[PDB]
Design a protein around this ligand. Structure first.
Ligand SMILES: CC(=O)Nc1ccc2c(c1)CCCC2=O
Length: 119
């Protein structure tokens, strides 16, 4: 029933994601010199360095807010890819499966802790 425990749990999960080879296209903002049409397709850029900085600045209130921004990294990959068989999109789907498998208990414990607080 620790209402604050999600923050260290999310720091440790971001560390694992940075060690994963599948995260490399997603660690920093998409390079507009490499992809000059990117902002014609994607209205809200997101990347794992921006997620980690927002967490360490104390600018997330809950793990649900962090989860929304990580899911935006993956939806941006699906929208920008020219093929569902592309190398970079294929990496995004493995990373998404890994993320979803690990964040489920983080979300469950936080929501249980808050219900107990408000009982
Ligand atoms: C398939 C292909 O040739 N290119 C491709 C696909 C997806 C993505 C990128 C390039 C770069 C930006 C991030 C992203 O998700």
């Amino acid at each position: 029933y620790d209402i604050q425990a999600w923050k260290k749990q999310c720091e440790e999960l971001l560390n694992l994601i940075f060690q994963c080879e599948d995260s490399e296209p997603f660690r920093q903002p998409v390079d507009l010199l490499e992809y000059p049409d990117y902002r014609d397709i994607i209205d809200t850029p997101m990347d794992f360095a921006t997620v980690r900085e927002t967490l360490e600045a104390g600018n997330y209130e809950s793990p649900m807010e962090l989860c929304k921004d990580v899911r935006l990294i993956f939806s941006n990959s699906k929208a920008y890819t020219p093929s569902k068989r592309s190398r970079i999109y294929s990496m995004s789907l493995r990373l998404s499966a890994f993320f979803e498998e690990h964040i489920s208990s983080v979300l469950s414990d936080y929501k249980s802790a808050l219900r107990f607080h408000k009982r």
